[PDB]
Amino acid sequence: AMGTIKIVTDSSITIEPELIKALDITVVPLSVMIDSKLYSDNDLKEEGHFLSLMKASKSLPKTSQPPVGLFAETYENLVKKGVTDIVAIHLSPALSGTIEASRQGAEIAEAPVTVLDSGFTDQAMKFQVVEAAKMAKAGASLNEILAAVQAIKSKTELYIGVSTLENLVKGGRIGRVTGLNVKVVMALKNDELKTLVKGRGNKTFTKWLDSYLAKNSHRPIAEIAISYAGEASLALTLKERIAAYYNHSISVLETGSIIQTHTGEGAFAVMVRYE
Ligand SMILES: [Cl-]
Ligand SMILES: [Zn+2]
Ligand SMILES: [Zn+2]
Ligand SMILES: [Zn+2]
Ligand SMILES: [Zn+2]
Ligand SMILES: [Zn+2]
Ligand SMILES: [Zn+2]
Ligand SMILES: [Zn+2]
Ligand SMILES: [Zn+2]
Ligand SMILES: [Zn+2]
Ligand SMILES: [Zn+2]
Ligand SMILES: [Zn+2]
Numbered sequence: 001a002m003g004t005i006k007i008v009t010d011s012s013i014t015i016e017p018e019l020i021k022a023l024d025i026t027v028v029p030l031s032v033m034i035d036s037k038l039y040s041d042n043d044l045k046e047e048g049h050f051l052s053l054m055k056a057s058k059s060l061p062k063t064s065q066p067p068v069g070l071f072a073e074t075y076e077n078l079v080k081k082g083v084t085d086i087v088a089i090h091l092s093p094a095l096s097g098t099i100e101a102s103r104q105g106a107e108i109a110e111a112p113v114t115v116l117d118s119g120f121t122d123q124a125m126k127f128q129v130v131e132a133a134k135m136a137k138a139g140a141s142l143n144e145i146l147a148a149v150q151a152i153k154s155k156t157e158l159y160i161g162v163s164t165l166e167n168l169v170k171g172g173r174i175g176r177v178t179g180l181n182v183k184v185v186m187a188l189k190n191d192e193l194k195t196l197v198k199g200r201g202n203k204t205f206t207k208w209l210d211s212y213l214a215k216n217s218h219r220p221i222a223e224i225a226i227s228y229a230g231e232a233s234l235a236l237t238l239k240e241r242i243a244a245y246y247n248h249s250i251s252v253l254e255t256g257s258i259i260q261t262h263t264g265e266g267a268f269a270v271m272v273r274y275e
Helices: 017-023 049-056 068-080 098-109 122-138 142-154 166-171 203-216 233-242 257-263
Strands: 005-010 026-028 031-034 037-040 062-064 085-090 113-117 156-162 183-189 192-199 221-229 251-254 267-274
Touching: 005 068, 005 098, 005 122, 017 122, 026 068, 031 049, 031 257, 049 257, 062 257, 068 098, 085 098, 085 122, 085 142, 098 113, 113 142, 122 142, 122 156, 122 221, 122 267, 142 156, 156 203, 166 257, 183 203, 192 203, 203 233, 203 267, 221 233, 221 257, 233 251, 233 267, 257 267
Parallel strands: 005 026, 005 085, 085 113, 221 251
Antiparallel strands: 031 037, 031 062, 156 183, 156 267, 183 192, 221 267
16 A cells, blocks of 8 residues: 555543554644643653642643644644655544544645544543554555544443542533532443442442443453553552453553543543454
8 A cells, every 4th residue: 555644643542652652653732721831731641740730739720622723733744754644533522622623733734634533532542543553554554544443443432430520510521421529430422421320439430340341241352441540549459350350461551631630530441442
């Protein structure tokens, strides 16, 4: 297949930077306002650092999608480097208008961008981005990349637990929750956060997870990942439970500032991709 394909995503992805570097993925940053100062999310990836900033702030941080003009410049630079097709994969439009900004920036740049809704964010979105970038590097065709991305998307599930509704309420994403200090597990399903279970202690999360795995793990999992906002202890406890049903490596990462702002501390996601 003639041409050079590159992958673009946004900074709501959660991934080791060694993979970004190995695969030449371009990550467009969102922004976050912290007590009247504007930060690029790409500057907020050092472990624990945003958590400290959020915990100390006088008021809740506020996120915003990347500027249309930042996408335009990003795509113009890629075309200048000789890139002939660009695949942009973004967090769900249920969560952010980032994906629209991406499409608008591409229009301005007059760039060959195919803009995809991942349906997720964080490590569930990483599943699609890594596959696309690996295949782009190998010289796969655009159509093969698009089919493979869609296959991954169709076999992915994302479950998120929160320990408070305050961040969801104050950042507005409570508007997606289909149902302030309580434990809740939701599925990110279509355009909504579908409430599955509600409870008082961390046992809300482990009971839910045990009943998920008992029901579903007979279907071979290709990959499973956990992310967290706050301290890692809860995620690591969850990892231990998954490990009893599932033999392979489990990626446990701190989620980024964009997600932390909207979930608050004591949140996690379990993200599963079936074979
Ligand atoms: Cl990773
Ligand atoms: Zn990794
Ligand atoms: Zn590292
Ligand atoms: Zn490059
Ligand atoms: Zn720092
Ligand atoms: Zn094309
Ligand atoms: Zn337009
Ligand atoms: Zn035009
Ligand atoms: Zn993977
Ligand atoms: Zn091929
Ligand atoms: Zn809906
Ligand atoms: Zn904490």
